[PDB]
Amino acid sequence: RPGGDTIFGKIIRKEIPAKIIFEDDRCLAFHDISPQAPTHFLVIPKKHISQISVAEDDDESLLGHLMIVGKKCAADLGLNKGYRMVVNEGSDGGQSVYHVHLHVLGGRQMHWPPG
Amino acid sequence: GDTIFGKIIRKEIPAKIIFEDDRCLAFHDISPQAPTHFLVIPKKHISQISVAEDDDESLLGHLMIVGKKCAADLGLNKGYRMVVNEGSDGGQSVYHVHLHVLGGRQMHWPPG
Ligand SMILES: Nc1ccn([C@@H]2O[C@H](COP(=O)(O)O)[C@@H](O)[C@H]2O)c(=O)n1
Ligand SMILES: [Cl-]
Numbered sequence: 001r002p003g004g005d006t007i008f009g010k011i012i013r014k015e016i017p018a019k020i021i022f023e024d025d026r027c028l029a030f031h032d033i034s035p036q037a038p039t040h041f042l043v044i045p046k047k048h049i050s051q052i053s054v055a056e057d058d059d060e061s062l063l064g065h066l067m068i069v070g071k072k073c074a075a076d077l078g079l080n081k082g083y084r085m086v087v088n089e090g091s092d093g094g095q096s097v098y099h100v101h102l103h104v105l106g107g108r109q110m111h112w113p114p115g
Numbered sequence: 116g117d118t119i120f121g122k123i124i125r126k127e128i129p130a131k132i133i134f135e136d137d138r139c140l141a142f143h144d145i146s147p148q149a150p151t152h153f154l155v156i157p158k159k160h161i162s163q164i165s166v167a168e169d170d171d172e173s174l175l176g177h178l179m180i181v182g183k184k185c186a187a188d189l190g191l192n193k194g195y196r197m198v199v200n201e202g203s204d205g206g207q208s209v210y211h212v213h214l215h216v217l218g219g220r221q222m223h224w225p226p227g
Pocket of ligand 1: 097
């Protein structure tokens with residue numbers, strides 16, 4: 001089972017259902033099960049990386065791809081007033097799934113501070 | 116159009132610089148929202164993430180890798196939150212793309 005056995009690894013292998021927005025060879029975008037904004041989705045690599053703090057230098061292109069896919073999906077979903085992208089790292093970040101992911105939230109005014 | 120982040124990159128006004136290389140700059144936010152709150156910005160003037168090009172992929176990822184390394188150097192061993200704001204709903208404050216890195220306290224949910 002490539003990609004590991006976190007919930008996200010299982011979603012990648014189609015073993016647990018998800019509402020998928022976009023998929024390519026490097027990543028997957030799907031809606032969050034507990035949305036914090038009218039639109040709230042995740043972009044995740046297919047390669048298993050536990051958290052941003054252990055990403056390798058050679059992961060730069062992949063991490064950037066998450067953002068490019070995030071912004072493209074946001075446009076496809078009509079978030080024309082903007083959105084917020086978030087990575088939660090570790091305990092202080094509130095991380096609950098240890099497979100790297102980018103949140104994209106929009107469809108309402110986001111506030112400051114960002115939590 | 117030029118922004119205050121352009122002035123910071125050009126060293127025309129001061130900032131507390133954490134790290135610099137040939138393609139990005141990291142510096143403490145002047146209005147910090149956590150005990151540690153810094154920005155990583157590209158030297159290339161991309162106004163907002165929504166207009167970033169495919170060729171910018173590795174540069175954007177570089178911001179994140181630099182951010183993670185700076186976070187470690189600043190002792191954020193308990194974690195942190197990275198944020199990119201887009202447009203008015205995103206609360207984007209400066210039209211030069213920037214990655215926020217916040218830590219040194221519990222970050223809460225929702226993220227704004
Ligand atoms: N089956 C699941 C389990 C979690 N999730 C979402 O994954 C996200 C994980 O983000 P954090 O690791 O930053 O908490 C949460 O927003 C959670 O609602 C999901 O969308 N589907
Ligand atoms: Cl901002």
